[PDB]
Amino acid sequence: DWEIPDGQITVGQRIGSGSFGTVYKGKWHGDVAVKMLNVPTPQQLQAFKNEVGVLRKTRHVNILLFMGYSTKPQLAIVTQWCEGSSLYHHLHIIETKFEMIKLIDIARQTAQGMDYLHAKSIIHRDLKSNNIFLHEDLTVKIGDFTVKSRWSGSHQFEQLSGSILWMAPEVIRMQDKNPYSFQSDVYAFGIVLYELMTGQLPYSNINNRDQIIFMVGRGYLSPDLSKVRSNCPKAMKRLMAECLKKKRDERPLFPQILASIELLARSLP
Ligand SMILES: Cc1ccc(NC(=O)N2CC[C@@H](CC(F)(F)F)C2)cc1-c1cc(N[C@H](C)CO)nc(N2CCOCC2)c1
Ligand SMILES: [Cl-]
Numbered sequence: 001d002w003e004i005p006d007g008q009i010t011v012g013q014r015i016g017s018g019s020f021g022t023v024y025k026g027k028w029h030g031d032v033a034v035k036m037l038n039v040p041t042p043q044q045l046q047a048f049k050n051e052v053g054v055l056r057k058t059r060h061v062n063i064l065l066f067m068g069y070s071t072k073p074q075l076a077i078v079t080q081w082c083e084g085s086s087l088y089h090h091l092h093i094i095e096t097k098f099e100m101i102k103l104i105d106i107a108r109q110t111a112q113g114m115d116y117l118h119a120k121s122i123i124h125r126d127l128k129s130n131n132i133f134l135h136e137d138l139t140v141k142i143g144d145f146t147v148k149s150r151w152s153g154s155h156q157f158e159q160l161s162g163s164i165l166w167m168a169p170e171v172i173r174m175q176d177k178n179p180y181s182f183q184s185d186v187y188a189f190g191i192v193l194y195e196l197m198t199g200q201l202p203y204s205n206i207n208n209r210d211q212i213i214f215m216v217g218r219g220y221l222s223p224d225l226s227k228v229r230s231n232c233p234k235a236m237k238r239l240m241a242e243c244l245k246k247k248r249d250e251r252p253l254f255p256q257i258l259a260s261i262e263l264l265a266r267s268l269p
C-alpha cells in the first residue's frame with residue numbers, strides 16, 4: 001500500500017504543467033514534488049494508473065524516487081524533491097563547462113539508470129537531457145518531467161509534436177505500429193552522450209525541423225562526432241557511434257554499454 005490519505009500533503013508553489021496534470025513543490029515528511037490533475041475521464045485515470053504502475057516497480061538511486069499517490073480527494077503522484085536543474089538546462093541554457101571526468105560520471109549514472117529500467121522491462125520512450133535531473137548538480141535522476149527548446153513555434157498540425165533530436169530513425173518513420181524498443185532508448189542515450197561530449201544539440205548547421213525529421217528518418221543525417229572535446233576518450237567516441245547506429249539490431253544493450261563506460265572510467269588521467 002502506497003496511498004497517501006487526504007489532508008497530509010501540503011501543496012505549495014506551482015513549478016510547471018508538463019505533458020499531464022500540474023506539478024507543485026509540496027511538504028510530506030519534508031519537501032516533495034506533487035503531479036496533480038484537477039477535475040476525471042477514463043483516459044486520465046488510465047494515465048495515472050500506468051504512471052504509478054511503472055514508478056512503483058523502481059527502487060534505484062539514479063531513478064526519481066516515487067514516495068506515494070493520492071486517489072481522493074483528487075489524483076496526485078508524490079516523488080522526492082531535488083535541488084538542481086535538468087542536464088538540458090546545465091548544457092544548453094546556462095552552458096556549464098563540466099570537467100571531462102564529471103561528463104563521463106553523468107554518462108555512467110544515466111547508463112546505470114537505463115540498465116535498471118531495461119532489466120525491469122521498462123522502455124522510457126522519451127529519454128533526453130530534459131528528463132535527466134542533476135540532484136545538487138551531482139547525482140543523475142531519470143524521470144518524465146519544453147521551455148521554447150530550439151523549435152519554439154507550436155506543432156499542433158504537424159505529425160511529430162514532441163522532441164525529435166533524441167528519436168531513433170525507425171521511431172521517426174513509424175513503419176511498425178510500435179517502433180519503441182530497448183535499442184530506441186539506446187539511440188536516445190547516444191544523443192545524450194553527444195550533448196555531454198560536444199556541449200551542443202545535434203544538427204546545429206540545419207534550421208528546418210521537418211528536414212531533420214526526413215533526413216534522420218532516411219539515414220542521411222547522424223551527429224558530427226568530430227565536434228567532441230579533444231580530451232574525450234577514443235573509447236567513448238567509438239561507444240557513441242555504436243549507440244547511434246541507424247540499423248536497430250546493430251545497437252548494443254545497456255549491460256555492454258555500462259561495462260564499456262566503467263572500463264574507460266578507470267583509465268583516464
Ligand atoms: C511529481 C512527479 C510525479 C511523477 C513524475 N513521473 C515520472 O517521473 N515518470 C513517469 C514514468 C517514469 C518512467 C521511468 F522511465 F522513469 F521509469 C518517470 C514526475 C514528477 C515530476 C515532474 C517534474 N516537473 C518539473 C516541471 C521539472 O522540475 N518535476 C519533478 N521534480 C521536481 C524537482 O525535484 C525532483 C522532482 C517531478
Ligand atoms: Cl515499493
Ligand SMILES: [Cl-]
Binds near residue numbers: 148150151152
Ligand atoms: Cl527560439
Ligand SMILES: [Cl-]
Binds near residue numbers: 201202203204222223
Ligand atoms: Cl551534428
